[PDB]
Amino acid sequence: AYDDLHEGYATYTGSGYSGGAFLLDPIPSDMEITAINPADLNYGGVKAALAGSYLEVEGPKGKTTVYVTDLYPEGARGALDLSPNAFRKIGNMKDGKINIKWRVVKAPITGNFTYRIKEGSSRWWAAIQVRNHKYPVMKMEYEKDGKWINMEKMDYNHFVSTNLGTGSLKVRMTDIRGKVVKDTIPKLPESGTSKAYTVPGHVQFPE
Amino acid sequence: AYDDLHEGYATYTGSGYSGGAFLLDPIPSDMEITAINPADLNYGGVKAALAGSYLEVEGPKGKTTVYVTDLYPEGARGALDLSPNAFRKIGNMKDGKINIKWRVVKAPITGNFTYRIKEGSSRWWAAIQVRNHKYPVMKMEYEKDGKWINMEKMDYNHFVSTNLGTGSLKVRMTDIRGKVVKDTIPKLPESGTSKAYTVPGHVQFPE
């Protein structure tokens, strides 16, 4: 995050803008993105640890920054699958593969987290995704009865729990650096949400 | 051995015609029903094992048959909480509690199972209830990729699984006698269904 380094290879793909595994839609068509190998994605034993992170990637021709929107299933350790507009900046498009170096960097964003409540969520079971986060989200907990409960991060880039209780939810997020922030999310319905929805958050990870 | 009676105590109550734990509503008011204590309800480590079963109950003044619609949360082992139209037939209501002996009997019904697919159910997660069954439903399994998958019975008298797959769902049910029957339910919804729905079945337990 502050400092980090990875060696590997990039190729390029047209997928990941819609229907990517991390459910980060919609992604603007001009956005520089990448899919990420499973080993590096699940950093620290957390599924989709690096989902929605940003990477600076260096190729033979220069450097660029990409947003991580999708899983790269066949990728070895260190391997990335870039969007054409990113690959173009750091490599020769006449090559189908290039040597790269990359690192998690701070998100080029502004403002606070946004939360996405997956359809089917309720007090009984909920999947909560964090968006617009400056650094990878390693951990998400919510308070219930004076105790802090850990949520499992899923392959689809949402933190899940059961019996979260009623009322608004106090949550806290931990980034890849170990930085902790806290926030409150509106209450979950008694019955599974007919549709997914976003809710504005009020914190951000530190610079 | 064969078909033992269970000794216990009965009380009476007007609840269970509506809002019963087993979600068997609506129950017509002329029906003889009972709530049942949790130990006897959860026969075989299976939650709501006796839900929607029928019991013959003998009290000091006679015998009658009742439909099990609800849980008797505070009930001791052996205990039943009957509807008063049932209770009156076997005991004197001026006494609050009576000595009984009871046993599961074949349901006085006809026709096939009727399935109820709980609101919220999809191919991702489904809760499927069996109604109109001649004997307690101890087991429900569905087929996927040529394998049979056990579905956990819940306190609310539905069998539950996840990732049930696509296409029509081949299911099999097992009763308290060990009898197995097989049926087919049409494909589950693409995503969470906002209302519970009904699927008339095409099989019944033998007898």
Ligand SMILES: OC[C@H]1O[C@@H](O[C@H]2[C@H](O)[C@@H](O)[C@H](O[C@H]3[C@H](O)[C@@H](O)[C@H](O[C@H]4[C@H](O)[C@@H](O)[C@H](O)O[C@@H]4CO)O[C@@H]3CO)O[C@@H]2CO)[C@H](O)[C@@H](O)[C@@H]1O
């Ligand atoms: O038991 C008490 C209580 O429970 C209620 O039923 C709950 C279940 O307890 C709960 O586990 C169930 O959770 C489902 C959920 O409905 C689905 O929406 C969700 O589907 C996910 C899927 O898991 C993902 O992999 C996929 O990618 O996305 C979808 C969603 O977008 O999966 C979970 C898995 O269990 O939800 C039920 C609530 O409707 C009963 O209704 C209630 O009567 C009981 O009192």
